[PDB]
């Protein structure tokens, strides 16, 4: 996260950290959507250009974790993975179209003051919140600048109009993506960066006061560049696939 700030304790209880089991290494962010399911980006699990192709046994997740280094006994929790599901039409060859995966935990995590699930949007929720200008929030343990924080980092960013998103890059954008960030001199800055993939782009609903995950950190070109924008997987657009997986393998 470039130009964000330290997250207060309990402010993102659905945050999940994805770890390579051996050796222990922090790979990506993720989010908790129920006591047994975790959402993340497909490229965090599968990406051949970087020789990446993980199976359940190779990873583990940490939840309710506030410090990168110390283990907060009885606060953070850990789970191994029972099964991983990547979107069947995930396009890693061209533009990361449908950059999304679900991970089923071996043992459900109990909710607490530091651990709770974020909501997934439904149609009326997506229709009124996903609008150019409205701001969302991104969190993560990724790089602090274009190429490692000790406390989870947070940044608030505005959703950008699709024509602008499309003209800002030569990569083929699709309806399964949305971009966010400030324009060339709206004065402010901020962006997600490498290592933040899988983390949530959330929005607080002004109608029922709940937090909803509208996106997943997916990709960008450099981090926080003038006239560039961060790209995010469009959760609602892929909601039917999410629900069918949970329903069938839950």
């Amino acid at each position: 996260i470039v130009e964000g700030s330290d997250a207060e304790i309990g402010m993102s209880p659905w945050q999940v950290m994805l770890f390579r089991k051996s050796p222990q290494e922090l790979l990506c962010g993720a989010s908790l959507i129920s006591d047994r399911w975790v959402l993340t980006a497909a490229h965090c699990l599968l990406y051949p250009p970087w020789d990446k192709n993980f199976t359940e046994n190779d990873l583990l997740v940490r939840i309710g974790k506030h410090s990168r280094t110390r283990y907060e006994r009885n606060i953070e929790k850990i789970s191994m993975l029972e099964k991983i599901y990547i979107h069947p039409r995930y396009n890693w060859r061209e533009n990361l179209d449908r950059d999304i995966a679900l991970m089923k935990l071996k043992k459900p995590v109990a909710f607490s003051d530091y651990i709770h699930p974020v909501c997934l949007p439904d149609r009326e929720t997506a229709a009124s919140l996903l609008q150019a200008g409205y701001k969302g929030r991104v969190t993560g343990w990724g790089n602090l600048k274009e190429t490692q924080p000790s406390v989870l980092q947070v940044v608030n960013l505005p959703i950008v109009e699709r024509p602008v998103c499309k003209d800002s890059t030569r990569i083929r954008i699709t309806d399964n993506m949305f971009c966010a960030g400030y324009k060339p001199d709206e004065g402010k800055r901020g962006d997600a960066c490498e290592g933040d993939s899988g983390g949530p782009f959330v929005m607080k609903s002004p109608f029922n006061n709940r937090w909803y995950q509208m996106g997943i950190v997916s990709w960008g070109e450099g981090c926080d560049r003038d006239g560039k924008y961060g790209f995010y997987t469009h959760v609602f657009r892929l909601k039917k696939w999410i629900q069918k997986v949970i329903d069938q393998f839950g």
Partner: peptide
């Protein structure tokens, strides 16, 4: 469902330090 409400914030009627910024962008 039990989602999207944080025990240390919404359940205690407390705002985090920057959510106001999000709320204002809607108007």
């Amino acid at each position: 469902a039990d989602c999207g409400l944080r025990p240390l914030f919404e359940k205690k009627s407390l705002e985090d330090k920057t959510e106001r910024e999000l709320l204002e962008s809607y108007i």
